[PDB]
């Protein structure tokens, strides 16, 4: 599997509210007291009253389509046999169950 991770919801000088998300093993949490930085400089001016929401979920791997295991349950098995039967110079190839 691959851990699907959403983009951070960063609110500068404010506060976000979390909402329900309908994803497998979906987790979401609000974090306060963050001062994010980017390549272009400090993202948010404020040092306090800052909110960074992180959201992540679990999703199937893109390789799963070809590489996967299949769980089966089996019962009441039947046997099919291939007998070569010659009765009085009559050679045949017989496919018959047991």
């Amino acid at each position: 599997y691959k851990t699907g991770m959403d983009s951070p919801a960063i609110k500068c000088c404010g506060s976000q509210e979390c909402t329900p998300t309908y994803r497998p093993d979906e987790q979401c949490k609000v974090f306060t007291g963050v001062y994010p930085f980017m390549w272009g400089g400090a993202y948010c001016f404020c040092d306090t009253e800052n909110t960074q929401v992180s959201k992540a979920y679990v999703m199937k791997s893109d390789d799963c389509l070809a590489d996967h295991a299949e769980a089966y349950k089996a019962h009441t098995a039947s046997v099919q046999a291939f007998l070569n039967i010659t009765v009085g110079e009559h050679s045949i190839v017989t496919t018959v169950y047991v």
Partner: peptide, 26 residues
């Protein structure tokens, strides 16, 4: 791409499905 290191847009999240190369195959 929905990267975890670039912050998201709060106004809206316009999204779709896009296929990826290099599939695992027999």
């Amino acid at each position: 791409y929905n990267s975890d290191k670039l912050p998201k847009a709060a106004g809206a999240t316009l999204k779709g499905k896009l296929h990826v190369p290099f599939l695992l195959a027999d």
